[PDB]
Design a protein around this ligand. Structure first.
Ligand SMILES: [Zn+2]
Length: 372
């Protein structure tokens, strides 16, 4: 019923489990959010995404702004109505994808100018334009617009990028607030930057706390620093963010990354891996990923994972899916993606249950032992 309310039900070490109540629904945390790139979670109907246990999905602000356009979607009734998803939606600021998929990017204090990677150039993105677009889409959790620091980054480089983003965090905060409809029904998350330098991350965390946000995201990770660095950064970074506010690790999604991140205080995750690998032929199982294309699954009558309760493992065998994917059939992409998303949602449930029960440390240990 409330606009945003985070409640921690249980803790174990730095890990915690709880819920985020929003107008459109409850979000059980640690939570994993499927990524819906072009107003659709690849190869899945919204009902199918809900069936796997997903409480929230992530929307793209860059992508959607180019096709079909923010203003267009608003006119049509908003992303929710447009895609058929009635629960909360968190939308990226667009800044990251601009710098990765845009042609001739132009950085400046006011924002970034770029060329759409497909048809001319839907061109300008600034803190306030980002917040506007996200309002037009009608997202429940809005991400402040920032400047991601590439890896590696020198201290001065990291410093100047972090400083800029904090200025942009303030601007995002103001923009968000000026739109009453948005400020009253949505939530705004700030993003900590600073690369791998704790002094920088500390500065970023303090700035952010001074401005004040509903949730704090740890940006800058999963950009090539490797699990070891990531975890090292998470170690000192997450304790810098308000404990009573959700911590969201952006773009982190290998099953072992999630488990390790939750051990360090992360509550929300998002990643294209489950959907991506699914189209690719890679299925996640409790015993490690398997590539269904491999000849040894040609006549395997067992489900993708014998402990997985998803619709695909309950109704089809590895042999059929193996065939589907090798034949290039759409159904294979559908079934694989459904399975991977279901797997990730089961992993988040197991994490949540183990934390509530004070046995997350043993679960992580057992998880890693069998998965690897
Ligand atoms: Zn399954």
């Amino acid at each position: 019923r409330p606009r945003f309310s985070f409640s921690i039900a249980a803790r174990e070490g730095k890990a915690r489990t709880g819920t985020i109540e929003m107008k459109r629904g409850v979000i059980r945390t640690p939570a994993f959010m499927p990524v819906g790139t072009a107003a659709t979670v690849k190869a899945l109907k919204p009902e199918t995404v809900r069936a796997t246990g997903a409480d929230i999905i992530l929307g793209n602000t860059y992508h959607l702004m180019l096709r079909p356009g923010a203003e267009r979607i608003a006119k049509l009734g908003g992303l929710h109505s447009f895609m058929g998803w009635d629960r909360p939606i968190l939308t990226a600021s667009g800044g990251y994808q601009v710098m990765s998929l845009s042609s001739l990017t132009k950085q400046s204090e006011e924002g970034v100018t770029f060329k759409s990677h497909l048809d001319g150039s839907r061109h300008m993105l600034s803190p306030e334009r980002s917040i506007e677009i996200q309002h037009l889409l009608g997202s429940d959790i809005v991400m402040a617009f920032d400047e991601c620091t590439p890896y590696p980054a020198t201290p001065s480089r990291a410093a100047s990028s972090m400083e800029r983003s904090m200025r942009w965090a303030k601007r995002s905060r103001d923009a968000f607030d000026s739109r009453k409809e948005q400020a009253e029904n949505a939530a705004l998350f700030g993003i900590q930057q600073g690369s791998v330098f704790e002094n920088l991350r500390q500065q970023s965390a303090d700035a952010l706390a001074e401005i004040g946000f509903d949730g704090y995201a740890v940006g800058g990770l999963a950009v090539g620093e490797g699990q070891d660095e990531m975890f090292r950064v998470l170690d000192f970074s997450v304790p810098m963010l308000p404990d009573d506010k959700p911590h969201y690790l952006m773009g982190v999604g290998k099953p072992d990354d999630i488990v390790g991140a939750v051990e360090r205080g992360i509550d929300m995750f998002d990643c294209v891996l489950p959907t991506r690998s699914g189209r690719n032929g890679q299925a996640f199982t409790w015993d490690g990923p398997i590539n269904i294309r491999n000849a040894r699954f040609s006549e395997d009558l067992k489900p993708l994972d014998s402990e997985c309760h998803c619709a695909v493992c309950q109704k089809w065998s590895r042999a059929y899916i193996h065939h589907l994917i090798r034949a290039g059939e759409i159904l294979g992409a559908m079934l694989m993606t459904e399975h991977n998303i279901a797997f990730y949602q089961q992993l988040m449930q197991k994490i949540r249950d183990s934390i509530s029960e004070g046995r997350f440390s043993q679960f992580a240990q057992d998880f890693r032992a069998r998965y690897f």
